[PDB]
Design a protein around this nucleic acid. Sequence first.
DNA 1: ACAGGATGTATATATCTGACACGTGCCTGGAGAC
Lengths: 443, 136, 442, 436
Amino acid sequence: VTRTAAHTHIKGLGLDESGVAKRVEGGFVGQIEAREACGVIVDLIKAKKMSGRAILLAGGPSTGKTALALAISQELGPKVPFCPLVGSELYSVEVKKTETLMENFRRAIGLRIKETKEVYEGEVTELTPEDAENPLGGYGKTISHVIVGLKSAKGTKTLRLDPTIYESIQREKVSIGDVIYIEANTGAVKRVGRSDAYATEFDLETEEYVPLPKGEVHKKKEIVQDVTLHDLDVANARPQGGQDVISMMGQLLKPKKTEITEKLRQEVNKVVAKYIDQGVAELIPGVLFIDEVNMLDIEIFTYLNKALESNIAPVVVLASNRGMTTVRGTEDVISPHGVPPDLIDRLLIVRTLPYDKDEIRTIIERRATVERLQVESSALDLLATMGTETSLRYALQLLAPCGILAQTSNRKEIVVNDVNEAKLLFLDAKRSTKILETSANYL
Amino acid sequence: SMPSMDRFITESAKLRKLDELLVKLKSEGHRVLIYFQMTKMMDLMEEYLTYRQYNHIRLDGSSKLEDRRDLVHDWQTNPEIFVFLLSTRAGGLGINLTAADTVIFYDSDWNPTIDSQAMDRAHRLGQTRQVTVYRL
Amino acid sequence: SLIAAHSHITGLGLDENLQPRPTSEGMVGQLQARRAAGVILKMVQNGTIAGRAVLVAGPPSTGKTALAMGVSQSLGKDVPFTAIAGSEIFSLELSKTEALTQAFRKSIGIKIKEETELIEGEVVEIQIDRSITGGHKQGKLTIKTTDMETIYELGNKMIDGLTKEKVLAGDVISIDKASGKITKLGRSFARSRDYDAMGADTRFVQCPEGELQKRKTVVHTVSLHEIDVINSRTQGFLALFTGDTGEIRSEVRDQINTKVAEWKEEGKAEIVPGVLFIDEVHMLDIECFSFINRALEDEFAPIVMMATNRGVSKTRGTNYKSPHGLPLDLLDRSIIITTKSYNEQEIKTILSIRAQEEEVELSSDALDLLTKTGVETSLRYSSNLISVAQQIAMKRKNNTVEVEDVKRAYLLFLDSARSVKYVQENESQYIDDQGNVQISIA
Amino acid sequence: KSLSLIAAHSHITGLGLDENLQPRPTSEGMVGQLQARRAAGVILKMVQNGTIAGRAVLVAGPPSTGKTALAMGVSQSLGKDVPFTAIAGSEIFSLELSKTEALTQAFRKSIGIKIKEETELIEGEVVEIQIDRSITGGHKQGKLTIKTTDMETIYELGNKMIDGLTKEKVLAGDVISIDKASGKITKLGRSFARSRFVQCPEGELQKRKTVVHTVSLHEIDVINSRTQGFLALFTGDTGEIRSEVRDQINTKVAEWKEEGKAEIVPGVLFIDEVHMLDIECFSFINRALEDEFAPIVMMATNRGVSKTRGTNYKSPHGLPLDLLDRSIIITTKSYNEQEIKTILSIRAQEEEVELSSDALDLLTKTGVETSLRYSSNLISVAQQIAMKRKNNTVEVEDVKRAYLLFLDSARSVKYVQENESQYIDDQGNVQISIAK
DNA sequence: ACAGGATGTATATATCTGACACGTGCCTGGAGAC
Ligand SMILES: Nc1ncnc2c1ncn2[C@@H]1O[C@H](COP(=O)(O)OP(=O)(O)O)[C@@H](O)[C@H]1O
Ligand SMILES: Nc1ncnc2c1ncn2[C@@H]1O[C@H](COP(=O)(O)OP(=O)(O)O)[C@@H](O)[C@H]1O
Ligand SMILES: Nc1ncnc2c1ncn2[C@@H]1O[C@H](COP(=O)(O)OP(=O)(O)O)[C@@H](O)[C@H]1O
């Protein structure tokens, strides 16, 4: 029916109203202390008061680190911006890594704005331009004004435009008998389609047929918009959407990342604070999630120390699975989790713990019942012993070949023989290393 | 991007199922009556009808008493009319609607007494074919 | 288009119970690996699960790339199969994660339903009105069939399609409304007055009858990466061919994912996942593996297949050694298929199939000698010797490869071990690792 | 103005000093560090005098001992219209600029030019608009009635003022501001008529407005280079401005200062984590400090006798000795327990957190035991644990619960070392299996 | 002091009349020249 991929049996942290966690709730099994700590972090994010609070999730492989961050994102809801990331993604070839980190910092602070629009709309009834006296004079356009007659439901208006608006109108290829939509905030013109007041079946260019727009031609409507700070920074750094030459040629050239200056961010902050002061906008801080944080080097860590101390930064969540490893970009610095001690001093570490046989067995039960598979009890116990012997993920990933081998024998139940056949056909890391060690020519 | 009729159709499940059987009902060459309850239950549906450019008229008692005299006459005389909208008690009381069989109830669940007169206006003497009642 | 290395493999050679035949569809031997690949093929064909990694490992010249070619051949049409090598990721205009993202998104196809109208008829009169500079174009087209006759209206691109492949009021054309394609089927009126400004020899077709306009439904498949590149900027369709798509932003991908889910909701489009095959995966950085570990957990992820032929080797970008050259966190979330080396009967059957593919007649003794030298040396060397021996036998004006031709080819063209021995016997004549060589022979 | 949630240094409003540059024990959100605060006050007076250029000051000490807080207090005490540039060390390793070019841009962003100018503005409340149009449209006549609370007048408009009033549509009852020379009309809002909302202006309609401008040297360098527009100040791709366009700016600024048309306002450039710069950057700084148009540079680092980047030897504070010869060093010391308690009380007061005395004693004890920053971070977590139990104040049990839930560095190191088989080490070895 | 049956409320509809609106034909007093 649907598609399942390594997750999506997790819907939330599954906590009570007082913060205590049920053992089996929300798709989670075990990890009670980590779930309660993540609930405290979720409440801290929902308080919307703090800036630059950073935690770190530490533990071994297959212990439930990224599942907790995904559960945090599901608990917060879609109105809070959540920016997933991998530590290898900060190494770009177009811009420096510091700018990529600051862009992903600004991408995690949302904004809700109740803005208003001025709209002229209706069906075009006439289109007559008036020429200039000296067309070849070098200065000034060919035309001077264009008379446009618009007709809507219980209304009719006549408009006199400059050549600037008419240039965008004729760029939209507007004829007589079309329904248009002029937005006065930017001069943008949208051609909705042919009107249905005329014949329909005599066209050859797959158009759509639109009724007459209701209400008057001139209108004022309120639109609720959800944007981030990075959207404003990008739209101001590379200007598009105006009717001038510079914003028109900006849509045609190839886009490229640029080092946004601090002055532009300060001006955008000033304008956004002015919008909030009028009661129009409202700030929604969010979460930045950097997975595999050991891939970063010392320069990004040293810039992260500076960037966490700013007065706008969101809540940062990191994850790592290294014991005591050298930091990348250095030679002698040995630190826990691959994170330097000055950054470790600014964190709050949440420990994650390994599982047992019972938790592995019920996790296999949950993953089997998510994937619409029916497993026998003896096969379930065999898979639980397999998971404790080798790996949890190897037992989880062997469910679908077992189901296929059961289906190819015209059967619905998964039995022990299917699990034995899947053991024979597919290997794991330890048996592959055993084959690699006793082999002739670098297998 | 302007609000899209399709997304308007597909975001409502009742209208989604309504658009399916109407295609084969038109392909059969038939006559359809649909009953309604709210204003906007019959203020959004003719947008869908004009999207399908179906021949339709709307009858309710908010309209004047003169129009009910000739709307029923134009329904019973013209065969090219396809869709006849209605409220509960506006035309389900004494109106001769023997030219159609398929009555479709959008939300007629108010009382069985009201619905028992509703198909009484259609399933009447003079019908020459089978009556298929669809309750949604 | 030419005779290639894996041109003799057409499928996997399996039954309905996924039991591999001993010799079928150009594949011999390797029953467990073929059965496992058939299970993976059924897993792709079901299309209900995402982000599963399969690793194919073994010694060199064993049939990993042959197995991947068999999987891609049995996968069928219109299902994407992206095959890349490990060294294509390192680019000068794209980061490694961006190139890996594009390679992941190229392997998911979107099948879109479309409604079109087909218009075929006989052209009566064309009127085209253009401005003085030729910018604005509009006009009316009068087309007809044997029963009906209609006057249409034309736009800019319809007029541009009519000006090319010039129609001369009596040609029979067919128009697709959604595609916008003009096809001139032929000439039916056969007019008398013809001026010498045209040199075509247009065919005599009949005037079509029946309905002028028909309704048709068409289905086409477009990958996710094409949709991203098209929606990225103004002229993205050229960048689909020139490769000038530099680091598409994440907002584009988020909005495309939401729009694709919306199209799936309305019944307009459906999702057909495919296979991404990364051959020679050991030539990848540690950052690529760290990206793959999180890219496999997404909703829109294909079935990733990797192949390698390394033992406990050094991982690139690190200073330690790992099994297969891959780190253990990636190996935890992968499923390993192991391939075995070949017998002599399998080698003889391989050589016979490759000889039949290259259209070479072989004797029994020549095949036995080729089997013996393919057992002693590698298999690929004895497979390469076949065409050379065929040319040598063709030089003597007989179309049958004999033992003397195989001996001559073995004499002329060397092996790896023979070349290593000849280098080590005369090491002063070659340039050493210290750059010393005796060029004088005295 | 200046939107912000809560910063890590938000409680500091400046250096706590009297008129004789002596530090109070607690003032303006700064606790302790008397000698460092006195030295920073001397440096602030040196910046305020403005007769001394190109002096380098190094702030060194252990981590989490008031180093960035001192520079934050200096930047607060500097006031407005004096440039302050704060960059990290790893921000100059760019892809489109060389390191010396980025350092030159950061140096020239901290020198300002103060220009005062005069202009004529008309700002009032629009009473009535009369616009008559001919059939041919050859000429436009008009009359504009505008008023303040003290005056009333009626104007006769020309053609282009009529065109500039039709554009940016002005109705009756609006409050607008008109520039005569440039022709720019700004709608300040709507006057108090209920039928955004701004009070009616007072006094004269025609007024003289003196505006004091402050332009950095970098802006003049960008503008005077004709290959780039002024949009490079916002997009950021100035792209290695040529050397010969800077001497013209220097000579012109010297000429303007001689003629009395402008004044030079020097500022402070602050480099945080200075140990991440290369040796070439230090060699460039050695000559860039000796210029006349050079600001006062404050650098901060916490390393001690480490390897200088780009070399293969070790040097004190990670800096070579020729740069340390050009600097005067301010040294910070570790904190006492009473100062830790006062700092934690100030941080709890900033976050409007009510603490019991026993909770404050527990936080002070665990701050002496582990870290100041860990005890600072625990307050906001324990507050949310307190709101989970539906009480306002923060008790001892909430602090103990937060201490149990969230670990520190030493406990995490202990848990890693006790179970190092389950983690990935430097050799890439791990044991994911539970049994055997 | 509590239960049970009355109205009260809400939140949509529905039909239907009441007291305003707007639109049109056509004459006599306003406009122009003197
Ligand atoms: N408590 C749990 N309940 C259910 N599934 C879990 C739990 N913990 C881990 N898993 C599963 O085990 C896998 C662990 O991978 P993940 O948590 O993403 O990163 P890591 O491998 O570093 O722990 C995930 O696929 C997740 O679905
Ligand atoms: N079972 C098989 N059927 C057909 N050809 C095979 C088979 N096994 C190997 N080959 C041949 O061997 C070569 C493939 O070897 P190779 O690509 O090196 O495998 P791998 O890359 O996995 O080591 C191809 O020339 C192929 O024709
Ligand atoms: N004298 C002080 N007064 C107020 N707060 C201080 C003082 N010293 C340190 N702090 C606080 O301690 C924390 C760490 O100090 P900081 O100077 O930022 O780090 P570092 O010393 O490593 O540069 C900051 O949040 C700061 O507010």
